[PDB]
């Protein structure tokens, strides 16, 4: 039960999205559940990069498209990263994924 | 199922699609049907606790 | 200040997604020489910045011309595109957009007998793109006018409900021509936006910046 | 009776359940449902042309006639190719 | 249970900037800068001297369902040039 | 038959105003909604493998 | 343990009390943001094309009006009425 | 008597203590737009700071960015005000954009002011709460300023280093003028050598030094060559200058 | 509001061992998402009233302009010719196939949303 809230929140949120997406899910419920993903997609639309995944499809860049998808959902791991960094800071340690050679 | 959730969607309450069914276009597979049945058996959380 | 809520998976959203992805696929991005990674990502973003918004422009012209074309097939309504200045203004505006883009690539001022010939055939795109839409929207409509005039001339003179085979044939021909007008309306909007893509995409080529220094092996 | 809800339900049961192809038994005479849709299309066009001509039939046609005439008018305002002549003759006809 | 009733709660709505499109088309139709399609600006002395029937001209008043093509609703001014 | 309008510039400006409104309404109202709905699905489809692998590595439950 | 504060604005569950308002895009919020960030730097080619067509059609309307004025003055100088009679 | 009456009225109704009294309501807006007009006075900006100091915790990201840019342009440091600004950025780090955070970090770098929590929240916001292509739209001078901020504070985040390193390019350094590109390249290479982080995109920085080596000094060319040797060893290859092809 | 999983964790931790198994249907109902029940059926909205009033206004204005035209009966039967094809479109178009074909144009509705799997996010 140390990190159960983050994993079960991920499960609950994606389960509700997958149950309702493309059928009756409102955009308000989507922007409420994942505000940072909507913020990143809105950045893409604002900066004239609305066809950016189409552009990565045109160049055949499969690894760049996989990275684009992974970076737009990179904030899902950020609660765990902040919690583990605070755990390492209370123990006096340095967080492993924060270091270059770590 | 996905066709059942589509039938309850607002677009099948629109006038041109009142009498249409979502199962008529793509029918649900039997894994989808038995998964809907199995999920209906597990919506009781006590039954899921006892089963697990 | 309060935006409306949208249902995911709506039919207008799906149709407009498919339409925009169709017009965006007309002028695709060039595949670079290098493997696209974080080194090549700012060059890819810069190359998207140099490219014109031909997907958005073609979607704009496709929607605004299929709407005005299908207005002419609604009862009590006429097509705005059946007017001369409207359709020809859309065509001259597309040609001027492509010309302004090409002038911005070459430095904002304009470039034996080959130079006049190709300049005449280039300047004719301004006329042609709008006039080929305008006379096509005048097409089935004026033929429809004259034909329904004769379709009125038959029972006005032979009796209201008598000689039904001749007026039946003329009304069958009229029904077939309004259906052909539907086909020509959708198809003329499509032809206009296909041509807008191939006219603007002639000047959509800028050179990739790329890496000026690498660490090989 | 809500003014639009009853209208919606009545138009729905007219649009879906009411079918003159089945209630008048037109499968005997006609091969398809689509052939009935085509015949009903051209029949709607003919009925509309005839009622638009019957709503006003004594008028002089703006459309060019095929050398013909309506019934017994023959040489009246209704069968005048000259429209100024037809207007002045219409006034004498209206005098009665 | 679904979000169907939540979307049934929202009524019909126009597109978000349709008032700007209507106010652009209407402003193009009413800021022509020229007289209105068969009218002529005249002097104020002529306009107050002229009666209402002589100001109207028959080409701008065609008959609704004319029994003869070319019937006009008004006869204009009886005074002819 | 009508061929020439009363004003060519008024009709061309009507075409420009209608197409500029369609451009604004596409860029501002339709494309943000379309890109939200499209890019949620596209980002999940592009990130399913790496996301599940990274979450599988971070999970101490096994 | 991981509390709510670690996922305060990052991850939320489906709403249980009420459906929130939709988050607006910055272009829906402001026409100035759309004008300075997308409309000018990406669509100024279209805007200049519409400007060119409106200017050119104003030139053509001026040519048409000057031709009508020339025919009107030629009819006045020749002692003819400039238009013919109306139907009524 | 128009002259003396008009002149007396104008000075009494138009001098800089009453247009500080119009600017008490919206201090971020007015301080930003007055500093952008060249009006930078310490006498007015102290009243700005103490007028806005209770309002800071409820300010939006736009107002925090406007205030922070204005107080860089005035060069007036208030410790309590910028502690409140930093608490606002730390409380709402998910709402801030990289476009705003670069301007905030540049002011927090101009005078020395940092926290471990502030550096962690700015790094988390740029790496995870914003788009990964936001450093591409940034401009290489702002990324270099943020890099030397994290280098001078000794706070090392490898994920933020990768994200901000992605913004360095031939495009972004080509947008800079040559005297500006010299300082940007030198400061970015110094930060990358301080952290010992050598990404692929350092080829764009080192190359931006070695394409035009005439503007650099001999000492700066020596430090650029040291960073080039270290990046050659870290990336496992040899640095080549690429001509047109 | 606060998130539903923390409410689940709190209200499950607050129950006793005897109270736990019968409370589980209540806790679930407090974590279920709000799906708003069908509210009051009003008549038409003021924008729907404006839309249909303006459409009928436009149709009457256009029919009055069509009747005053020179070949007016030609225009009035063109209206019949266009309404006939509207009626035939209501009969001929397979609206369910058209709906599901439009669902295939967008990639968000052409496929099921494939993302987070259960086995990666299992908590124990
Ligand atoms: Zn017509």
Contact indicator for C64, C19 with CB cutoff of 8 Å: no
Q: How far is the CA of C4 from the CAs of A27, D35, E12, F10, I61, in angstroms?
A: 9, 44, 11, 34, 32
Can you tell me whether residue E62 is helix, strand or coil?
A: strand
Contact indicator for E3, B5 with CB cutoff of 8 Å: no
Contact indicator for G45, C101 with CB cutoff of 8 Å: yes
Can you tell me whether residue B24 is helix, strand or coil?
A: coil
**Residue D25, phi then psi, degrees to nearest 5:** 65, 50
CA F10 / ligand 1 centre spacing (Å)? 21
Same domain, H153 and H76: no
In Å, the largest CA–CA distance within chain C is: 92
> Does F36 contact chain I (CB < 8 Å)?
no
C with F: how many residue pairs have Cβ under 8 Å apart?
71
Q: How many angstroms separate the CA atoms of I52 and I49, rounded?
A: 5
Contact list, C157 vs chain D (CB under 8 Å): 65-66, 68-70
Which of D4, D87, D90, D92 should be substituted to probe chain E, the one whose Cβ sees the most E Cβ atoms within 10 Å?
A: D87
For residue C8, give the nearest of A27, A56, A61 by CB distance: A27
Q: Do chains E and I touch (3 or more CB pairs under 8 A)?
A: yes
Find out whether C33 is annotated in a ligand binding site.
no
Q: How far is the CA of I118 from the CAs of C67, H68, I115, in angstroms?
A: 46, 45, 10
3-state SS, chain C, equals CCCCCCECCCHHHHHHHHHHHHHHCCCCCCCCCCCCCCCCHHHHHHHHHHCCCHHHHHHHHHHHHHHHHHHCCCCCCCCCCCCHHHHHHHHHHHHHHHHHHHHHHHCCCCCCCHHHHHHHHHHHHHHHHHHHHHHHHHHHHHHHHHHHHHHHHHHHHHCCCCCHHHHHHHHHHHHHHHHHHHHHHHHHHHHHHHHHHHHHHHHCCCCCCCCCEEEEC
Nearest CA in chain D to I87: D41
Q: Do chains E and G touch (3 or more CB pairs under 8 A)?
A: yes
Contact list, A22 vs chain C (CB under 8 Å): 8-9
Interchain contact, A51 vs C45, CB within 8 Å: no
Q: How many angstroms separate the CA atoms of C85 and C131, rounded?
A: 9
Residues spanned by the domain of H167: 136-242
Contact indicator for H56, H84 with CB cutoff of 8 Å: yes
For residue F15, give the nearest of C9, C56, C90 by CB distance: C90
- H/E stretch holding E9: helix E4-9
Q: Which residues contact F15 (CB under 8 A, 6 or more apart)?
A: C80, C85, C86, C87, C89, C90, C93, G53
Q: Compute the residue count for chain D.
A: 96
Where among H120, H135, H150 does a domain terminate?
Answer: H135
Contact list, C74 vs chain I (CB under 8 Å): 82, 86
CA E37 / ligand 1 centre spacing (Å)? 19
Half-sphere exposure of H216 (CA within 13 A, CB side): 23
Same domain, H97 and H144: no
CA E59 / ligand 1 centre spacing (Å)? 20
Contact indicator for E61, E70 with CB cutoff of 8 Å: no
CA E72 / ligand 1 centre spacing (Å)? 21
Q: How many angstroms separate the CA atoms of C87 and C192, rounded?
A: 10
Interchain contact, A61 vs C36, CB within 8 Å: yes
Token readout for A74 is 């990179």
Reference A53, options C205, C25, G38; nearest CA is C25
Contact list, C13 vs chain B (CB under 8 Å): none
| C55-58: long-range contacts, CB 8 A cutoff, minimum separation 24 | C55/A51, C55/C20, C55/C23, C55/C24, C55/C26, C55/C27, C56/C20, C56/F23, C56/F26, C56/F27, C56/F31, C56/G42, C56/G43, C57/C97, C57/C196, C57/C200, C57/F23, C57/G43, C57/G46, C58/C23, C58/C26, C58/C193, C58/C196, C58/C197
Contact indicator for C179, C172 with CB cutoff of 8 Å: no
Where among H135, H168, H184 does a domain terminate?
Answer: H135
Nearest CA in chain B to C9: B11
Which of B3, B4, B5, B11 should be substituted to probe chain A, the one whose Cβ sees the most A Cβ atoms within 10 Å?
A: B5
Q: How many angstroms separate the CA atoms of F60 and B26, rounded?
A: 40
**Residue C7, phi then psi, degrees to nearest 5:** -80, 130
- Residue H111 gets the label, from left (phi > 0), alpha (psi -120 to 50) or beta, of beta
Nearest CA in chain A to G33: A46
- H/E stretch holding B32: helix B30-41
Question: Can you give the C-alpha Rg of chain H in angstroms?
Answer: 22
Reference E57, options G85, C125, G36; nearest CA is G85
Same domain, H127 and H148: no
Contact list, G7 vs chain A (CB under 8 Å): 5-6, 9, 79
Contact indicator for H186, C192 with CB cutoff of 8 Å: no
> Does F23 contact chain C (CB < 8 Å)?
yes
Q: Which residues contact D67 (CB under 8 A, 6 or more apart)?
A: none
Q: How many angstroms separate the CA atoms of C155 and I25, rounded?
A: 75
> Does C152 contact chain I (CB < 8 Å)?
yes
Residues spanned by the domain of E42: 1-81
Q: Do chains I and H touch (3 or more CB pairs under 8 A)?
A: no
Same domain, H127 and H33: yes
* Eight-state DSSP code of residue G38: I
Query: If 0-12 CB within 10 Å is exposed, 13-18 middle and 19+ buried, where does residue A61 land?
Result: buried
- H/E stretch holding I84: helix I72-92
Interchain contact, G45 vs C52, CB within 8 Å: yes
Which of E21, E31, E35 should be substituted to probe chain F, the one whose Cβ sees the most F Cβ atoms within 10 Å?
A: E21
Nearest CA in chain C to H163: C38
For residue C215, give the nearest of H133, H169, H203 by CB distance: H203
CA E27 / ligand 1 centre spacing (Å)? 25
Sign of the Cα pseudo-torsion (H30, H36, H40, H45, in order): positive
* Eight-state DSSP code of residue F28: I
Contact indicator for C52, C198 with CB cutoff of 8 Å: no
Reference I30, options H62, H191, B45; nearest CA is B45
Q: How many angstroms separate the CA atoms of D46 and C124, rounded?
A: 44
Q: Say how many Å lie between the first and final Cα of chain A, rounded.
A: 27
For residue G10, give the nearest of A5, A16, A36 by CB distance: A36
Cβ atoms within 10 Å, residue H106: 17
Interchain contact, B8 vs A19, CB within 8 Å: no
Chain I closest CA to F20's CA: distance in Å? 23
Q: Compute the residue count for chain I.
A: 124
Per the structure, the count of domains in chain E is 1
Nearest CA in chain D to I70: D62
Same domain, H117 and H158: no
**Residue I119, phi then psi, degrees to nearest 5:** -70, -25
Contact list, G43 vs chain A (CB under 8 Å): none
Contact indicator for H165, H197 with CB cutoff of 8 Å: yes
Nearest CA in chain D to I89: D37
Packing angle of the helix pair I72-92, C164-200 (nearest 10 deg): 80
Q: Do chains H and E touch (3 or more CB pairs under 8 A)?
A: no
Q: How many angstroms separate the CA atoms of I19 and H89, rounded?
A: 44
Token readout for D78 is 């209704």
Task: Please check whether residue H93 lies inside any domain of the structure.
Answer: yes
Contact indicator for A4, I9 with CB cutoff of 8 Å: yes
Same domain, H157 and H79: no
Same domain, H131 and H141: no
Find out whether C205 is annotated in a ligand binding site.
no
D13: Cα separation from own chain's centroid: 26
Q: How many angstroms separate the CA atoms of E70 and E74, rounded?
A: 12
Contact list, I120 vs chain F (CB under 8 Å): 51-53, 55-56, 59
Q: How many angstroms separate the CA atoms of I108 and I113, rounded?
A: 7
Contact list, G6 vs chain A (CB under 8 Å): 6, 79-80, 82-83
Q: How far is the CA of H100 from the CAs of D21, H89, H96, H104, H142, in angstroms?
A: 68, 11, 7, 6, 11
Contact list, A29 vs chain E (CB under 8 Å): 3
Same domain, H131 and H162: no
Chain A closest CA to I80's CA: distance in Å? 38
CA F2 / ligand 1 centre spacing (Å)? 10
Q: Which residues contact A87 (CB under 8 A, 6 or more apart)?
A: none
Interchain contact, G50 vs F19, CB within 8 Å: yes
Same domain, H144 and H235: yes
Q: How many angstroms separate the CA atoms of B11 and I102, rounded?
A: 12
Q: Which residues contact H164 (CB under 8 A, 6 or more apart)?
A: H126, H135, H143, H146, H147
Interchain contact, H166 vs C37, CB within 8 Å: no
Where among H116, H135, H154 does a domain terminate?
Answer: H135
Chains that touch B (3 or more CB pairs under 8 A): A, C, D, E, I
> Does G54 contact chain F (CB < 8 Å)?
yes
Q: How many angstroms separate the CA atoms of H158 and H167, rounded?
A: 15
Q: Say how many Å lie between the first and final Cα of chain F, rounded.
A: 81
Per the structure, the count of domains in chain H is 2
Q: How far is the CA of D35 from the CAs of C179, C211, H99, in angstroms?
A: 16, 66, 64
CA I63 / ligand 1 centre spacing (Å)? 11
Q: Which residues contact D60 (CB under 8 A, 6 or more apart)?
A: D77, D78, D80, D83, D86, D90, E67, E68, E69
Sign of the Cα pseudo-torsion (E5, E11, E14, E19, in order): negative
Experimental method: cryo-EM
Q: DSSP states of A25-93 as a string?
A: -BHHHHHHH-HHHHHHHHHHHHTT-TTHHHHHHHTT-HHHHHHHHHHHTGGGGHHHHHHHHHHHHHTT-
Same domain, H111 and H141: no
């Amino acid at each position: 039960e140390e990190e159960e809230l983050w994993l079960l929140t991920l499960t609950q949120q994606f389960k509700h999205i997958q149950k309702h997406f493309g059928i009756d899910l409102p955009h308000s419920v989507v922007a409420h559940m994942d505000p940072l993903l909507i913020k990143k997609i809105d950045w893409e639309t604002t900066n004239a990069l609305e066809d950016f995944d189409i552009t990565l499809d045109d160049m055949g860049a499969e690894d760049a498209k996989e990275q684009w998808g992974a970076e737009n959902l990179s904030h899902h791991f950020l609660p765990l990263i902040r919690y583990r960094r605070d755990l390492a800071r209370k123990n006096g340690d340095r967080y492993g994924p924060d270091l270059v050679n770590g | 199922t996905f066709a059942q959730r589509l039938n309850s969607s607002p677009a099948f309450s629109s006038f041109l699609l009142k009498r249409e069914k979502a199962e008529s276009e793509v029918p649900p597979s039997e894994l989808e049907l038995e998964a809907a049945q199995k999920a209906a058996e597990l919506e009781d959380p006590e039954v899921a606790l006892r089963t697990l | 200040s309060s935006v409306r809520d949208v249902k995911t998976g709506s039919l207008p959203t799906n149709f407009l997604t498919g339409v925009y992805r169709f017009w965006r696929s007309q002028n695709p991005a060039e595949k670079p020489h290098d493997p696209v990674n974080d080194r090549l990502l700012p060059a890819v973003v810069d190359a998207s910045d140099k490219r014109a918004s031909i997907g958005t422009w073609a979607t704009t012209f496709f929607c605004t011309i299929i709407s005005c074309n299908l207005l002419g097939l609604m009862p009590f309504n006429e097509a705005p595109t059946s007017g001369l200045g409207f359709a020809t203004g859309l065509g001259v505006s597309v040609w001027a957009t492509a010309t302004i883009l090409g002038l911005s690539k070459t430095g904002f001022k304009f470039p034996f007998i080959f130079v006049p010939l190709e300049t005449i055939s280039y300047t004719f795109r301004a006329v042609s793109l709008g006039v080929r839409l305008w006379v096509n929207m005048l097409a089935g409509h004026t033929l429809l006018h004259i034909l329904t005039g004769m379709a009125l001339a038959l029972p006005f003179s032979l009796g209201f409900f008598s000689m039904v085979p001749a007026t039946f044939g003329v009304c069958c021909l009229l029904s077939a021509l309004v259906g052909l007008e539907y086909l020509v309306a959708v198809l003329q909007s499509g032809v206009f936006s296909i041509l807008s893509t191939v006219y603007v995409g002639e000047f959509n080529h800028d050179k990739f910046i790329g890496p000026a220094a690498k660490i090989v092996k | 009776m809500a003014v639009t809800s009853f209208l919606g339900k009545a138009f729905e049961k007219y649009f879906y359940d009411f079918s003159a192809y089945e209630q008048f038994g037109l499968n005997r005479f006609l091969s398809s449902k689509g052939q009935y849709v085509a015949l009903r299309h051209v029949g709607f066009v003919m009925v509309g042309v005839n009622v638009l001509l019957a709503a006003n039939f004594p008028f002089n046609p703006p459309f060019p006639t095929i050398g013909m005439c309506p019934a017994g008018w023959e040489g009246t305002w209704v069968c005048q190719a000259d429209k100024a002549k037809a207007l002045e003759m219409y006034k004498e006809w209206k005098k009665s | 249970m679904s979000y169907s009733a939540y979307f049934a709660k929202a009524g019909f709505q126009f597109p978000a900037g349709l008032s700007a499109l209507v106010a652009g088309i209407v402003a193009l139709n009413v800021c022509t800068g020229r007289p209105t399609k068969g009218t002529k600006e005249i002097s104020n002395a002529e306009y107050n001297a002229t009666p209402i029937g002589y100001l109207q001209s028959p080409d701008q008043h065609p008959t609704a369902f004319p029994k003869v093509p070319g019937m006009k609703d008004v006869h204009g001014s009886p005074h002819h040039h | 038959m009508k061929l020439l309008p009363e004003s060519l510039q008024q009709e061309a400006a009507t075409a420009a105003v209608v197409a500029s409104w369609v451009l604004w309404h596409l860029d501002t109202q339709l494309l943000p909604t379309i890109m939200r709905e499209h890019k949620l699905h596209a980002c999940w489809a592009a990130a399913a493998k790496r996301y599940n692998e990274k979450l599988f590595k971070l999970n101490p439950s096994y | 343990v991981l509390g709510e504060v670690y996922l305060k604005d990052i991850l939320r569950t489906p709403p249980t009390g009420a459906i929130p308002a939709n988050v607006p895009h910055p272009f829906q919020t402001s026409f100035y943001t759309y004008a300075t960030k997308k409309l000018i730097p990406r669509h100024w080619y279209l805007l200049g094309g519409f400007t060119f067509t409106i200017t050119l059609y104003g030139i053509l309307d001026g040519l048409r009006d000057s031709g009508k004025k020339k025919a009107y003055d030629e009819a006045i100088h020749a002692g003819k009425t400039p238009y013919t009679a109306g139907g009524h | 008597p128009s002259q003396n009456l008009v002149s007396t009225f104008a000075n009494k109704v138009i001098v800089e203590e009453n247009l500080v009294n119009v600017a008490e309501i919206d201090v971020p807006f007015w301080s930003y737009w007055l500093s952008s007009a060249g009006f930078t006075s310490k006498d007015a900006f102290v009243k700005f700071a103490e007028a806005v100091k209770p309002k800071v915790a409820a300010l939006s990201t736009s107002d925090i960015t406007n205030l922070t840019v204005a107080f860089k342009r005035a060069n007036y440091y208030d410790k309590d005000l910028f502690t409140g600004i930093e608490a606002n950025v730390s409380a709402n780090f998910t709402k801030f954009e990289t476009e705003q955070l670069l301007q905030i970090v540049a002011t927090f770098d101009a005078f020395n002011h940092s926290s471990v929590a502030f550096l962690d929240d700015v790094a988390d916001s740029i790496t995870y709460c914003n788009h990964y292509l936001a450093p591409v739209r940034a401009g290489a001078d702002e990324l270099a300023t943020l890099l030397t901020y994290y280098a001078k504070n000794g706070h090392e985040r490898a994920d933020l280093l990768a994200t901000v390193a992605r913004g360095f390019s031939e495009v972004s350094l080509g947008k800079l003028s040559a005297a500006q590109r010299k300082d940007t390249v030198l400061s970015a290479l110094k930060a990358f050598q301080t952290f010992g982080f050598y990404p692929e995109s350092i080829e764009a920085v080192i190359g931006a030094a070695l394409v035009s080596p005439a503007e650099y000094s001999a000492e700066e060319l020596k430090e650029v060559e040291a960073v080039k040797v270290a990046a050659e060893n870290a990336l496992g290859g040899e640095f080549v200058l690429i001509q047109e092809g | 509001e606060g998130n539903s999983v923390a409410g689940i964790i709190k209200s499950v931790n607050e129950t006793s061992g005897a109270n736990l198994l019968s409370s589980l249907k209540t806790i679930k109902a407090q974590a279920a998402p709000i799906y708003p029940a069908a509210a009051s059926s009003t008549g038409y909205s003021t924008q729907a009233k404006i839309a249909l009033f303006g459409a009928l206004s436009w149709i009457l204005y256009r029919a009055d302009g069509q009747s005053k035209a020179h070949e007016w009966i030609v225009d009035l039967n063109l209206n019949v010719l266009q309404a006939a094809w509207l009626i035939s479109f209501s009969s001929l178009i397979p609206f369910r196939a058209v709906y599901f074909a439009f669902r295939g144009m967008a990639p968000a509705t052409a496929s099921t949303l494939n993302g987070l799997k259960t086995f990666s996010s299992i908590s124990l």
